[PDB]
């Protein structure tokens, strides 16, 4: 069997077994607490329904209003700052879902915007990320000869890995201060943001109408998300990206 | 100025102006309808508070319970099928947020799981995507000689672009049937899923306890998300990926000549 076919089949087996391992671990850690939380909340639902004399339909009518008011609770999500924050989540593939296009036309433009945007943003982060790696490579080379010279891959992975933790820590310290979260909650938010997972369980600028009332903090969160993705993007360009073109290189080697 | 530095500065200017254009368009399409729905919902909030004799604190107490019961409403989100669906959203960077780690330990494991998982899944989709492109290149070459031969980039972009639409069309057809959405809503869901945006406004397997009661549809949903990301990932490997190594190639070209 060809090297390309062995590498591909191994990766498929690895990904599927990694999914089976993950599903097994996430079951052990989250199955029992979810069952505990459901029964606890159902007891709280029955207690408050009895306290405020509510029927099955009576609770359900109030249930729909509370759920539909959730994106409005954070404030105006669609003005210039609201739409700029949303535009980021689309092209950077974060997509928290805190604000989503409610209109048919908005949904269409969002698709066309993503089609051209996502590749443009991806190429931008890999290009700027490479310039940072080249600057780091030059600065380290100049520092090596300065003290009394060759920059290795291992030195680049070390600086790269530390730069990623530093970006998560600088962020965590700031988001725990402004969004009033714990350092761990803010660290978890920064991880999920910069890895483009963006669950939406933690979203910045969604407290005390920050998008319209706090421009200085909005300016920082836009700068942090963009600079942070460049730091992670630089590490991907250095370590991850080289394994994606691997199949094309072996196909060229075969010819 | 160097070619690498001009290309990087142009991309930064392009991305920021694309953000300003987007923010301007999303303002025009969503500002007025959001203001309309907020005022409509605030009146409905006041109406139902008056109907069921609710105070400021009374509504707020019921508000917390309704919000906390939202992930439970869809059913059991953390059994084998629920956790497998969640594991997908993490490593594929979709992350709908329909189900999120409620425990401190679950949040930690998710971070470690993502750290190794995301690069593994990304490399897997680019590797399997390349094998699909190579198979398509071979099948077209054999078909060309069959009718009476050289496969160009333009032919590959055409087949690739059609393969992406067909995946969204097959998907929308299924998701509008099982998740009872419109073809457009299911097409929008498929687009947002396969582009790894994953807002969470549309999430499959969250209707009629599908994760625990419908195994056949769960198996399809996992297969579609995984095969669909390979189809999109193949097109990226063909068109987008070549522009990422561009700066490294010019840096190598600078060293070679000098
Ligand atoms: C090959 C590339 C093709 C790109 C095509 C992209 C098309 C994207 C889809 C646009 C959807 C527009 C929906 C308009 C809804 C109008 C109805 C309505 O409520 O009107 C009342 C309201 C009040 O009227 C408007 O909102 C006025 C129309 C404003 C439209 C400005 C944005 C245009 C964006 C596309 C061009 C830029 C690129
Ligand atoms: O899964 C895919 C995929 C695979 C097939 C198709 C497809 O569809 C399409 F690309 F079209 F959206 N996406 N990814 C491709 C896009 N992103 C990559 C990405 C990262 C990143 C990556 C990994 C880590 Cl650990 C941390 C940050 N950061 C950014 C910032 C802006 C833009 C993109 N970033 C996520 C991975
Ligand atoms: C902190 C983060 C950013 C680190 C990311 C680590 C990656 C660089 C790792 C994670 C999984 C690894 C892959 C896991 C499995 C394989 C199959 C393996 O295949 C073989 O050994 C058979 C073919 C051959 O001999 O080439 C080749 C390496 C590869 C792609 C690995 C390449 C490196 C990967 C992408
Ligand atoms: C290369 C990097 C380091 C610099 C890029 C330029 C920044 C200085 C720009 C890019 C985006 C800008 C932000 C885009 C949007 C807004 C919202 C704006 O707020 C409003 O318009 C409030 C009313 C509304 O929401 O309509 C205030 C400025 C701010 C934070 C901008 C501040 C300046 C920012 C961060
Ligand atoms: C349907 C989807 C998947 C199509 C994706 C289209 C991409 C292939 C496009 C979108 C934005 C484009 C970029 C927009 C701007 C530039 C800057 C441009 O820079 C210059 O012209 C100056 C330097 C030089 O001359 O090389 C080089 C091409 C590049 C990276 C483009 C490369 C091709 C990109 C990534
Ligand atoms: C290379 C490709 C084309 C094939 C990959 C193998 C598939 C046939 C596997 C991979 C993941 C599997 C799924 C993983 C999880 C589940 C949930 C499982 O449901 C339960 O365990 C219900 C109870 C619970 O939630 O704990 C039923 C089988 C199913 C759909 C599996 C069916 C078979 C799947 C789609
Ligand atoms: K997301
Ligand atoms: K993503
Ligand atoms: K995402
Ligand atoms: K999300």
Curated annotation (Swiss-Prot), chain A:
Taxonomic superkingdom: Eukaryota
Record note on what altering residue 248 to C does: No effect on channel basal activity
Annotated consequence of substituting residue 122 to V: Found in a patient with DDSA; de novo; gain of function; increases channel open probability; results in increased potassium currents for homo- and heterodimeric KCNK3:KCNK9 channels; impairs G-protein coupled receptor-mediated inhibition; does not affect pH dependence
Compartments where found: Cell membrane
Effect of substituting residue 229 to A: No effect on channel basal activity
Name the record gives this protein: Potassium channel subfamily K member 3
Disease link: Pulmonary hypertension, primary, 4: A rare disorder characterized by plexiform lesions of proliferating endothelial cells in pulmonary arterioles. The lesions lead to elevated pulmonary arterial pression, right ventricular failure, and death. The disease can occur from infancy throughout life and it has a mean age at onset of 36 years. Penetrance is reduced. Although familial pulmonary hypertension is rare, cases secondary to known etiologies are more common and include those associated with the appetite-suppressant drugs. Defects in this gene may cause developmental delay with sleep apnea (DDSA). A disorder characterized by developmental neurologic, skeletal and respiratory anomalies including microcephaly, arthrogryposis, scoliosis, cleft palate, facial dysmorphology, bilateral talipes, feeding difficulties and central and/or obstructive sleep apnea. Malformations are detected as early as 21 weeks post gestation. Severely affected patients require ongoing treatment with nocturnal O2 or pressure-controlled ventilation. The disease is associated with recurrent de novo gain of function variants.
Gene field: KCNK3
Effect of mutating residue 227 to A: No effect on channel basal activity
Function: K(+) channel that conducts voltage-dependent outward rectifying currents upon membrane depolarization. Voltage sensing is coupled to K(+) electrochemical gradient in an 'ion flux gating' mode where outward but not inward ion flow opens the gate. Changes ion selectivity and becomes permeable to Na(+) ions in response to extracellular acidification. Protonation of the pH sensor His-98 stabilizes C-type inactivation conformation likely converting the channel from outward K(+)-conducting, to inward Na(+)-conducting to nonconductive state.
Example of a GO biological process term: cochlea development
Tissue: Widespread expression in adult. Strongest expression in pancreas and placenta. Lower expression in brain, lung, prostate, heart, kidney, uterus, small intestine and colon.
Variant or mutagenesis effect after changing residue 236 to A: No effect on channel basal activity
Chain segments annotated as transmembrane: 9-29, 108-128, 156-176, 220-240
Effect of residue 228 to A: No effect on channel basal activity
Binding site for K(+) 3: 95-96, 198-199
Effect seen on changing residue 6 to C: No effect on channel basal activity
Catalytic activity as recorded in UniProt: K(+)(in) = K(+)(out); Na(+)(in) = Na(+)(out)
Outcome following mutation: residue 250 to C/R: No effect on channel basal activity
Intramembrane segment boundaries: 78-101, 181-204
Positions of region (Selectivity filter 2): 196-201
């Amino acid at each position: 069997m060809k090297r390309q076919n062995v590498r591909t089949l191994a990766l498929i087996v690895c990904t599927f077994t990694y999914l089976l391992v993950g599903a097994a671990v996430f079951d052990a850690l989250e199955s029992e607490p979810e069952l505990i939380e459901r029964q606890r909340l159902e007891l709280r639902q029955q207690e408050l329904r009895a306290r405020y004399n509510l029927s099955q339909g009576g609770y359900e009518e109030l249930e729909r209003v509370v759920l539909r008011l959730k994106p409005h609770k954070a404030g105006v999500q669609w003005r210039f700052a609201g739409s700029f924050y949303f535009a980021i989540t689309v092209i950077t593939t974060i997509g928290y879902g805190h604000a989503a296009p409610s209109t048919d036309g908005g949904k269409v433009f969002c698709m066309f915007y993503a089609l051209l945007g996502i590749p443009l943003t991806l190429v931008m982060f890999q290009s700027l990320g490479e310039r940072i790696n080249t600057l780091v490579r030059y600065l380290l080379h100049r520092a090596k000869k300065g003290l009394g010279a060759d920059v290795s891959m291992a030195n680049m992975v070390l600086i790269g890995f530390f730069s990623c933790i530093s970006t998560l820590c600088i962020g965590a310290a700031a988001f725990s201060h402004y969004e009033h979260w714990t350092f761990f909650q803010a660290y978890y938010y920064c991880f999920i943001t910069l890895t483009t997972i963006g669950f939406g369980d933690y979203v910045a600028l969604q407290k005390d109408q920050a998008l319209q009332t706090q421009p200085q903090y909005v300016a920082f969160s836009f700068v942090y998300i963009l600079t942070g993705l460049t730091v992670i993007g630089a590490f991907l360009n250095l370590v991850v990206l080289r394994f994606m073109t691997m199949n094309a290189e072996d196909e060229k080697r075969d010819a």
